[PDB]
Amino acid sequence: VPVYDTCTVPGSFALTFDDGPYGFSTRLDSTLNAANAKGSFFINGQNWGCIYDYADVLLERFNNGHFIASHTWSHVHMNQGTYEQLSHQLELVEQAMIRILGVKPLYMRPPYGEYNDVVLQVLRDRGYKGLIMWNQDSGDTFTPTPSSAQIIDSYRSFPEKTISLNHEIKDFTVDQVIPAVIPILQQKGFSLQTVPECLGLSSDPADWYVRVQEPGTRDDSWTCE
Numbered sequence: 001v002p003v004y005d006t007c008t009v010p011g012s013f014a015l016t017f018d019d020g021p022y023g024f025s026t027r028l029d030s031t032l033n034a035a036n037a038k039g040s041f042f043i044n045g046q047n048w049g050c051i052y053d054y055a056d057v058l059l060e061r062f063n064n065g066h067f068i069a070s071h072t073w074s075h076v077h078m079n080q081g082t083y084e085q086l087s088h089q090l091e092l093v094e095q096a097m098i099r100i101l102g103v104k105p106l107y108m109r110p111p112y113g114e115y116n117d118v119v120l121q122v123l124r125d126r127g128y129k130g131l132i133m134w135n136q137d138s139g140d141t142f143t144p145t146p147s148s149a150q151i152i153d154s155y156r157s158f159p160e161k162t163i164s165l166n167h168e169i170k171d172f173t174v175d176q177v178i179p180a181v182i183p184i185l186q187q188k189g190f191s192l193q194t195v196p197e198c199l200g201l202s203s204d205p206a207d208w209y210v211r212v213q214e215p216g217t218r219d220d221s222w223t224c225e
């Protein structure tokens with residue numbers, strides 16, 4: 001399976017967000033949507049909330065052309081898992097997206113940026129088309145944590161074709177950084193694209209997923225316990 005860390009489309013720039021959705025996600029998506037900016041979201045199943053409790057955010061995200069991909073169910077250190085454990089960690093997110101959205105993801109980003117040959121083999125066997133890394137880090141999960149002003153200033157020098165790592169579980173990323181950096185990036189000539197579009201893969205959201213069935217209605221299986 002191919003590993004990607006840099007866009008190829010001239011002028012493109014990928015704002016990417018890990019570990020969500022979360023309690024500020026509706027705000028984040030409204031900010032992106034108001035600027036016609038597209039985000040890439042690498043979601044968990046049970047980590048900072050249960051994915052089924054975020055179904056409405058996920059549906060808005062899906063239907064507005066944002067890119068949704070897997071970050072594993074439980075945010076595991078994948079280099080420590082067996083083939084079978086990793087397959088389960090991916091299957092569980094696939095199943096949630098099948099229930100909520102009717103589709104399976106074709107892409108994923110490994111927690112901690114940690115992967116190996118077992119990870120790549122599981123991805124190949126499960127039909128994934130790509131493992132998505134990054135090439136610039138906002139620092140929003142560094143500890144001690146930089147200020148929003150520091151993060152915004154770092155964004156002023158991230159060049160074209162950046163795939164930027166952010167975490168939507170950080171309130172200041174949603175409330176301070178992204179509202180400041182969208183105009184910085186758009187006004188200097190960058191196109192805020194999803195990762196597949198910026199890689200010269202398809203710009204059609206339907207090509208980022210495999211349709212399995214019609215989206216489900218919420219029932220008692222929409223649970224993480």
Ligand SMILES: O=C(NO)c1ccccc1
Nearest residue numbers: 018019110111112113167
């Ligand atoms: O899982 C992660 N981000 O979503 C991660 C964690 C540590 C370092 C780099 C990335």
Ligand SMILES: [Zn+2]
Nearest residue numbers: 018019111112
């Ligand atoms: Zn993560």
